[model samples]
Target chain A: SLLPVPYTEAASLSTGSTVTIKGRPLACFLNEPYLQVDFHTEMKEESDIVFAFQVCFGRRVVMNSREYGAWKQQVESKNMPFQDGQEFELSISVLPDKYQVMVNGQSSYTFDHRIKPEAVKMVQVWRDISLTKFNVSY
Target chain B: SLLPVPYTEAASLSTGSTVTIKGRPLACFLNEPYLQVDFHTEMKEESDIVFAFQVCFGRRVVMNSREYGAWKQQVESKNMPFQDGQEFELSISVLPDKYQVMVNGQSSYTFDHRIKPEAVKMVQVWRDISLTKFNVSY
Candidate 1:
C-alpha cells in the first residue's frame, strides 16, 4: 500500500470532475471487510457529508448523505463487482446530475446529486482496505 | 495502540474462559467505525467461525456463527456501551450456556452458544479500531 488509509484530501467538484482510487480489501470478502468514501462539506471528519458511499464486501453497499449532522435517506445495493482478494480500481465521476461509480472499469452504481457537487470541500477514503493510488481530476 | 489492528491469535475456549480486548475506535462516532471479533474453528481465515461478534461504533452490535461456510442465525443488539473516542475494555466470557460480553466492565450483551466453545481454535480482532491489549485466560 502506498497511500495512508483514512486518507483525506481537500477537494472541489463540478460536472466532469473525477476521483479515482486503487485499493484492495485488507481481508477476504468472507470476513466482510469494508470500503468507504465520503465527500464532506468541510475538512473536519465530523462535518456534514455531501455524499457517503460504503461497501460491505460480499454483502451490500450503502450510500447516503449527512446534512446538519443527521443522516439523510440511505441508498442500499447488493451488487458485488470487485473480485475477492484482488486489487480494484474505483472511480467516481461527477456528472451534471449524478455521480457514477465504476468498479474495475464497469459502471456499477450511480447516485443522484443530493447537493451540488460544488459544495464538496473534502474527500476521505477509509475503513478495511489498503490504498495504492488516489487522484482527483478537474 | 500497543497491539496491531486486525490482531489474530491461536486461542481456545471452555467454560470459565475469558477473552479480553482493550481498544479504541479509529474514527469518530459520526464516521461509524466498527470493531469485530471472530472466533474460528481453525487458524485459517477461511475456516468456519464458531462465533462472530461485530459492533458498529455508536450504533449496534451483531453476533452470529458461520457453519459449513454459511452464516447461521444472527443476534443483534442496540446496546451502545462504548463511549465515543474513548478506550474500551471488551470481555467475552464463556459461561455454562452462553458467552457474556462486558464492555468497560459492564455486562452489555450475551449470546447462547451455537457451537461449543471448545470448537474455537483461533480468534481474530479487526476493523476500524486500534488495539491496546488482548488476552485469553481460562
Candidate 2:
C-alpha cells in the first residue's frame, strides 16, 4: 500500500518544491544508497533504462541534464540488495537555487537550481517504483 | 501538526524491526553513511547536542565514543545542496547485525544491529515532521 502526501493544505509547491521519501526495505550497492522512486521515463520500451528523480519547478524539470543524468549510474547495479522490514525516512528541502535531500537524517545528494525557481508550482511524485512517504515543503 | 505512530497497524514497528530516515536534506556534514537510532542519553538537550542521529539494531544503540558520542564527523559541515522540487529517496534494509540505509537510491549508512533487530516493533514520527507514507513487505 502507498500513502499520499500529508501536508497538502499547509504548504504548496511553487517551482522549487522539495520532495522527501522515507521508510525501509532499502537497497544498497558498493556502500552506496540506492532506492527506486515513483518517477519513470515515458519513452516507449525504454528498458535499458536510466531512471532519475527530478524536481519539477512548474513545467521545467530541474536536474535533467547530460552530466547530472549520469549521476544515477554511480549507484545503479544489480548487486545491490534490499532488506525487508526496515523503516526509513527522507527529507527534501527546496530552495531558490538548489535542493537539499536528507536520508535517514543524513544529507546525501544535492542538485543545482536549473529552472526558474519562481515558476515552480505544485509538486508531484511519479515514477516506476514504490515509495513510502512523499512531502513537499516551501 | 504531527503524526503519531500507529502501533496496532501493519506499518507499526515490532521488536527487532529496523527503521531508517531517508531522503534527507543533502548536507556536506553527513558524509559517512551510518545509522544513529535515538535512545537514552545525557546529551539530549539542545545545548549539548553535537550529533543529530543514532543507530539501533535490535535493542542496543550504536554510537561513537568521540565528542558527544559522535562516531563520525567528516561531512558534518560540508555544503551539499540539492535541487528544490526534486525527489530524493531513502530506504532501510534490516538484518540481524545491522540496518543498511540508502539515500537518493544510494547506500550511505550502516547501523550495526544493536537491539536484536527483531525486538523493535513500534515506529514513531515526531516534531516538525509529517510522515507521508509507510509500507512493509515480508
Candidate 3:
C-alpha cells in the first residue's frame, strides 16, 4: 500500500528487460477483483498498447494488443496461480519471441510479441489491487 | 479528488433515502474505465450485495444483486449520459419499489429492489474513478 494504485511509469523494454510488481488484491477472491497491466506505445493512457495483461482474480486471464487504436487477437487462459487473500509477486520478462509471465517464482503465462518490446514507452498497472513495489529492469 | 478512490461508508437506506457521489474517471473514456457502487448487506466487502451498480464509461451499465454469495439476475443498459473527461455527479434514490439512478442530474437508469433497502449495512464505491464527495441521506 506504499504505492498509489493506477500506477503509471514511463518505461522501456527490450529482450533482456524485466518488469516486477509486488501487490495484493483489494477485495477478496469471492468478489472477483481484477488486476491489469498494460504496456503502451505512448505515454498517453489512451495510446495503443503493445501488451495488455489482465486477471480476473479467481476467474480467468486475458492478454491482447491494441495496434493503431484497434484491438488485435486476444488470448485467454484459466490458469490461476494467485492464492486467495494473500500478497502476490508478479514478474514479466521480455524474451525474443514472447513475454513470459511469472507468478510467485513460477512461469505462469506467456504472450507472443505482437509488437517489439522496444515499442513500449509506458507501463500502467491498475484495477482492483494495491501496490507496494514496481520496477523495470534495464 | 478529496475522497479516496475505493471509498467505503457504513450506511443504511430505506424509502426516500438518497446516496450521492461525485467523482471523475481516472483515465480517458477510450480506455473503458469503470465505476462501481455496491450496497452490501454487511460491513464486510464480500458480504451479500443488495444492489450492484456498474458503469463502463463510454459503453454500458450493468446492475445486479448478490444473494447467498451468488450473483442474481443482471440488468444491462446502454444508456450513456456521462461526458468524456468530465466530472460526474451521481445520485441513487430509493423509491417504494426500485432504486432510481440519476447521472449529472438526469434520470439514467433504474433497478427494481431484489432485496429490501433495510438489508444494506454498507456502501462501497470503487473502480477506475477518483471520488470527491460521498454522502448518504439519513
Candidate 4:
C-alpha cells in the first residue's frame, strides 16, 4: 500500500461559485507548511497557473497570473486558520472580479483576478497534505 | 434566502475505500449541531437507509440500519474534534467489517457495518452543514 504524500486533483471553478479543499497535513507540516492551489485556463499542470493560493508558515499569500506567467504582487493575510498537522477546510469563492477566501468557514482573505473570472477553467491543489475533500459547486 | 441546505451527489463506497465529506456548518449549527450521513441504495427519503452516521453536541451519536429494520447503538467517543462555527472534514474509510471514522482527518471512532460494505450503493451527506465534497475512491 502507498504510505502517503502530496495529493492533487482537477476541478471546475466558475464565477459566483465555490470550491472546497479540505485535508490532513503531512507530519512535517510545521517545518514545511506548503499548500499551492491554482486555477488555470486548462487542467494541464503547465496550463498556466493563473491563480495560486499559497500558505507557508506565518505567511498566507494569494496571487494571480496573466498568460500563465508573471504572478501579480502577492496578497498576504494576517489570519492563519489551519494548525499544523490538523485537518482543515479552505473555501475559494468566485466573486464578480475577486476570489473570496474562507478558512474553517470564516472569511479570511481575497485574491483579485488578474484575468477574467470566467476565463478560469480548472482548479488544482497540491503539497504537504493529504486531501480529504476537493469539490466545486454552484 | 439561500436554499434550505446543500444536497450532495451519491457516492460509491466499498471495503478498502474511503469517502470525504467536508463543509461549513450553517450559522444555526451552534444552536443545533446535528449532522447526519446515510448510505442509501437511492436518494429517496424513504429508500433503503442501509447505514447512518450521526453527530450531536457533546458527542451524542446515533446510527441506524434499514432493510434489517434495526437501529445501531449510540456510542460516544472520548474526544470531540469538531469546533463550533468552523468548517469541518469527515472521513469514512470502509474496512472489511467496519467503517474507520475520522474527523478533520484524525481517528475519532469506528462504526461496525450493519449492512455489508459492498452492499452500500450510495452515500448521502447533509443537515446542519453545507456539504462541500462527497467522494468515494479506492
Candidate 5:
C-alpha cells in the first residue's frame, strides 16, 4: 500500500548523527496501522528512494532497498514494541553498519545500507496515524 | 563526601540537543553522595562557571547557577531514582525553559533558567559514584 504523506526535505544524513522522532499511535490504528521512514535521493515524483523502513505491517517491521521501482528485502524481524495509542520515541543512529534505531529507547528493526550512504539526500516520513516532534542532529 | 574521578571533557552542548549519561553507583556509597553535570564556559577552573547539576546530597537532585562565589539554587527536587551500586541512565535535554533532565529514562529533576542561555560552552562530568557509557547528541 502506498503511503500518502507531506513530503519534506531532510539534510543529508551523515555517520555518527542521530535522528529522534517522537509520536504516538492514534486511537483508530488498533486494527490496521503502519508508520515509516524513507530515505530518498531527491524530492521529486520519480526521485530515487534508496532505503525504506516500515513498522507494524503484518506484525513485522520491514527494512528494504528500492531500486528502479523494485523492492528487495534487506531485513525482516518480528516483535515491534509499539502498542496502540501509546506515545513512542524513535532514535535512529548512523554508524558503520548502523542504521541503529530504537522505538521508545529500544528499536524494533534496524537496516543497513544497500545503496551508498551518501546517496540519501532526503527523508520522507509517512505515518498512518499521527506524529509530533522530529529532529536530526550530530 | 567526594569520590575522586578521572574527569572527561565533552563537546559543547547546543540548544535543542540532548545528552545521555549512563553509569553505576559504587557499592561503597551507602552513605551521603551525589553525581553532577557541570557546564563551563572555558577549560580553566576559574573560567566563567555557567551552570551545575547535582544529584543525591540527600534524597534530592539539585540544579545550580554558579556565577560568583555562591551557588544559587535553581531546581531542588527530592527523591533520586539511583539505587546504591545499581546502573542507571541520566539524560539532560537543553530546552528554552532551561535544562530538562531524567534519571533511568525518567526525569528526577528539571531546571528552569536562572542567569541566561548560551553561556553553556562545554560539558564536564564529576561524580562521587562510578559511571560509564556517557553520550551526547541532538
Candidate 6:
C-alpha cells in the first residue's frame, strides 16, 4: 500500500487534496530508524526536474536535479545536503490558506494552497515509504 | 573614546542585572568572519556563564560554562557546539520592540526591549568582538 500512485487518480479518489499519511512503524523499512515522505514528479526524458517542499506555510523549490550547478546552488542557499539512510518525519498539513509542512515538529516550509482543494486529491508515495496511520477530517 | 565611562559609583554587579553605557566601536577586538554573538557573565570568584541565542524570536540558551553536564546536555539537545571567534551584527530599529542580532545577514536573534531601557546604556567590547558599523538618526 505504500507505493506510488497516479496523481490524477489520487486527486479524483481522495476526499480531500490534502492528505495526511503517517509512515510505517520502525520495523517496516530496511532497518532504518525513521520515516520520510517524498513527493516527487514522474521522470520524463531523463531531463532535470525541480522538487518542492511545502512546510511551515512556505513554498520553496529544491534546485533542478538535472544540473550540478543548480543543485549545489539550492543546497547552499538552504543550508541543506542529502544524507543517506537518514529518517525524517514529513507531515503535510493542508489548510485553507496554505500547506504547512512540519519535520519532526519543527516548521520547515509552507506552500500556498494554490491547487484547488479538489485538484490535489491524489498523492504518489515512493516505494519503501511507510504509512503508520493517517486521517482526513473535513 | 570607544570605551564607556566605568560606573565608578556602583558597588556590585551580578546576573539578571542590566547595565548600560556608551562607548566607541569595538570591531578591532572581534575576529573576522564573525559567526555568533555570545553573552557571558563574569564574577569576582569565577567567570562561568550561560550562553543563549534568539532562535526565531525565542531565547534559546545553548550552553553554560559551569557544570560539564549542562554544557554536554545542550550539545545533545541542539546539535550545535560552542565555538570561539564568531561575529554578529546587532541592529536596532525604531520599533522599540527588540534589538535584532544578525549573523552574515542570515541567522538572527532578538533581545526584547527590557522595561528599563536606560539600564543597558553602556556597551563593552570583548576579545574577538567587534562593532561593525552603525547609523544614527536624529
Better of 1 and 5 by DockQ: 1
lDDT tens digits by residue: candidate 5, A1-138: 122232355657778777777765432232224666777777652465666777763377877776776657567778767766677788877877758878778756667767776777777665443557667784
RMSD of each: 1.1, 15.8, 1.1, 17.5, 20.7, 19.0
Q: Write the per-residue lDDT of candidate 3 for residues A1-138, one digit (tens) a residue.
A: 899878999998999999999999998998778899999999999999999999989999999998898878989999999999999999999999999999999999999998899999999999999999999997
Give the native contact fraction of candidate 3. Answer: 0.80
Q: Which stretches of candidate 6 lie over 4 Å from their true place?
A: A1-18, A24-87, A127-131, B1-138
lDDT of 1 by residue, A1-138 (tens): 799888999999999999999999999898889999999999999999988999999999999999999999999999999899999999999999999999999999999999999999999999999999999996
Q: Provide the lDDT at B76 for model 1.
A: 96
How well does each candidate superpose onto the true structure, as a TM-score? 0.97, 0.29, 0.97, 0.45, 0.45, 0.27
In model 5, pairs of residues that clash are A102-A107, A103-A106, B59-B79, B102-B107
The 10 consecutive residues of candidate 2 chain B with the worst lDDT sum are B25-34
DockQ (C-alpha based) per candidate is 0.78, 0.02, 0.78, 0.01, 0.01, 0.01
| Tens-digit lDDT string for candidate 3 (B93-131) | 999999999999999999999889999999999989999
Q: Which of the two, 2 or 5, has more DockQ?
A: 2
lDDT of 4 at A71: 46
lDDT of 6 by residue, A1-138 (tens): 343211112223122334455443322121112222322222221222222331111112332122321222332124222133334455566656665666556665555533343443334332223344454444
In model 4, pairs of residues that clash are A104-B87
lDDT of 5 at A32: 29
lDDT of 5 at A40: 77
True contacts kept of 2: 0.00
What is model 2's DockQ versus the real complex? 0.02
lDDT (C-alpha) at residue A5 in model 1: 82
lDDT of candidate 6 at residue A57, scale 0 to 100: 14
When only the first chain is scored, the TM-scores of the models are 0.99, 0.46, 0.99, 0.82, 0.84, 0.43
lDDT, candidate 1, equals 0.94
Model 6: how far is B60 from its true place, Å? Answer: 44
